[PDB]
Amino acid sequence: THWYYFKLPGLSRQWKGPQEALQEAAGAALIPVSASSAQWIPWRLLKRAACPRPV
Numbered sequence: 400t401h402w403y404y405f406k407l408p409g410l411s412r413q414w415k416g417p418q419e420a421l422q423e424a425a426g427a428a429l430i431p432v433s434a435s436s437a438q439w440i441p442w443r444l445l446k447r448a449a450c451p452r453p454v
Contacts, residue, residue, distance in 0.1 A: 404446040405430050407438070417448035 402417040405428075420428040427439040 402448040402450055403428055403430060404448055405440050406444040407432065408441060408444055
């Protein structure tokens with residue numbers, strides 16, 4: 400899994416996350432943005448965070 404800071408494609412003065420991507424595709428990652436929704440965020444609105452370590 401890759402983890403990302405994200406901005407929403409249609410808003411955004413603050414970075415959100417980092418969040419674990421649920422899936423990756425060409426030019427976008429599927430990011431949880433609420434308790435009931437995920438959004439395909441284009442790369443230009445993502446920053447790759449370091450992966451956290453299992454406990």
